[PDB]
Amino acid sequence: KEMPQPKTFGELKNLPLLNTDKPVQALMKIADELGEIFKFEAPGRVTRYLSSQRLIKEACDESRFDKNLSQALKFVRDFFGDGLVTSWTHEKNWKKAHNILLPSFSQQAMKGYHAMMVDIAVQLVQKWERLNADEHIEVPEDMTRLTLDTIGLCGFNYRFNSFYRDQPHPFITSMVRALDEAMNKLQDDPAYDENKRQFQEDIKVMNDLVDKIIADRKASGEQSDDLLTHMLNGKDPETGEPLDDENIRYQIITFLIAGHETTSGLLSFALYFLVKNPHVLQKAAEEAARVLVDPVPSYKQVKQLKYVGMVLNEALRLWPTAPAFSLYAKEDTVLGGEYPLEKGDELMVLIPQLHRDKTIWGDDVEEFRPERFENPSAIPQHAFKPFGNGQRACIGQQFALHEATLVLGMMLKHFDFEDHTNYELDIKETLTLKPEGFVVKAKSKKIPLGG
Ligand code: HEM
Ligand SMILES: Clc1ccc([C@H](Cn2ccnc2)OCc2ccsc2Cl)c(Cl)c1
């Protein structure tokens, strides 16, 4: 009945516990100590972190709890506006944008996206084919090159050309530097006149890209029917109106970021686990060689990479790259027959801890075993939630998994991988998670590509 709560620092409640670069991992340690639920207090705010499937399945009941804009989400709303990720479920532009953009992520749009995904995937493979002996691969860096280019090309017919650059595309660098400048600005001096600029030019770099993506499309003798097409011309089935110009800008920035960061972390973590578990890599590589018999993979061939998809879900089990989502109680209710909640109370689903629930997965929760996912009907409801919940679940789930399956399959078909530094897992936390510094050597199997 009584709610566990970690340690207090007087007025600053529990916050100094998150005075760290890895707050999610710190919150996971707190969950290990206190268990399935614990209150976390901050000046003027209370959050309850859930970690067990028993409680989280109640939280995922949309008749009792709806998606909450956490403080983090309310903060980044300055950048993402009332786009799909940062709007309330009862905000009119959420339902309207959901209705308009849902057809862009169907298992029919994916068929039309496939060739452009292959385009960027081939560029990745060719980069690694062209490395000299004893040169190595910066894995999350190259996965980000891939996922950024893929969402840019598939969604907006815009080429970031990340494999033509030595460092991240200026749009990425400007946003990363703009987000932290907004973080530090919360804490009017002469020496900040340089900061308020790096800011202004960063805002301009991103407004210029959004302007160009829209202008390129309007000037195009267009054979285009992609995500941007529906943003600009899709009519709402309810109201019959398209999205307004301001919301469209927010959706473009929303999908550019959401469309690549979490998928890059997934591919990075999957390759990390494969090189740390050579028996699983050998098994996945055998499926890639068996299934991908053509110079470029086809849509149907990717859908037959069954074990690769299991490798991906097991990487999402251990390190779901969007590791938490927030809910609020629609009315007074009792959670799990033990914990009374008031209307408006916030719940935070700690996905990595949920995915380590021994009562669901057994004692070996830390082992990388993709065979856990051989029979999806053996996985209880709400035990596996890497893509959120309900009507506010990830609209891009199928996009991410198709891209990641295609790419990982092509990686396994064309290269043997060596953990040449004996890499020690270091998880950097930004908007997503990724294994920082993860490097490998890839020896080419010398299998031709197509074109
Ligand atoms: C492995 C990769 C990904 C993971 C783990 C992931 C995870 C999630 C999660 C947990 C949520 C719910 C957030 C919340 O409740 O506050 C969400 C929502 C969302 N995601 Fe993803 N995502 C991934 C890839 C993508 C991709 C590729 C796209 C776009 C192409 C995308 C776009 C979105 C959008 C627009 C929403 C908001 C949906 C709505 O509320 O209407 N995500 N995602
Ligand atoms: Cl605290 C927090 C941090 C990051 C995210 C999302 C996760 N994610 C990515 C793709 N699907 C879900 O990434 C940041 C982001 C990207 C566009 S808008 C927006 Cl916020 C959320 Cl939801 C909440």
Residue numbers in the entry: 3 to 189, 194 to 457
Task: Please quote the paper that reports this structure.
Among the bacterial P450s, one of the best characterized enzymes is the Bacillus megaterium CYP102A1 (P450 BM3), which Armand Fulco’s group identified as a fatty acid hydroxylase that could catalyze the hydroxylation of saturated fatty acid substrates, primarily at the ω-1, ω-2, and ω-3 positions. P450 BM3 (BM3) is a natural fusion of a cytochrome P450 (N-terminal) to a FAD-, FMN- and NADP(H)-binding cytochrome P450 reductase (CPR). More recent work in our group has used the double mutant (DM) form of the flavocytochrome P450 BM3 enzyme (F87V/A82F), in which the first mutation expands available substrate binding space in the active site, while the second mutation is more distant from the heme but causes a structural readjustment in the P450 that alters its conformational state. We also report the first structures of the BM3 DM heme domain in complex with four different azole drugs, confirming the greater plasticity of this variant and its ability to structurally adapt to bind to several azole drug compounds.
However, the structure of a P450 bound to tioconazole has not been reported previously. The crystal structure of tioconazole-bound DM heme domain is the first shown to bind this azole drug. The binding affinities for the WT and DM heme domains are 18.4 ± 0.9 μM and 0.39 ± 0.03 μM, respectively. In the case of voriconazole, it was clear the 2 R,3R-stereoisomer was bound, while for tioconazole the R-tioconazole was identified as the bound stereoisomer. Similarly, small mother liquor-derived compounds are present in the case of tioconazole (a molecule of 1,2-ethanediol) and voriconazole (a molecule of glycerol). The voriconazole, clotrimazole and tioconazole structures contain multiple monomers in the asymmetric unit, and in each case the general protein conformation corresponds to the “open”, substrate-free conformation of the enzyme, with little significant difference in protein or ligand conformation between monomers. For all the azole-bound structures reported in this study, the hetero-aromatic nitrogen ligand is oriented so as to fit within the groove of the I-helix formed between Ala264 and Glu267/Thr268. The binding mode of tioconazole to the DM heme domain is similar to those of clotrimazole and voriconazole, though the latter interacts with the heme prosthetic group through a novel ligation via a pyrimidine nitrogen from its 5-fluoropyrimidine ring.
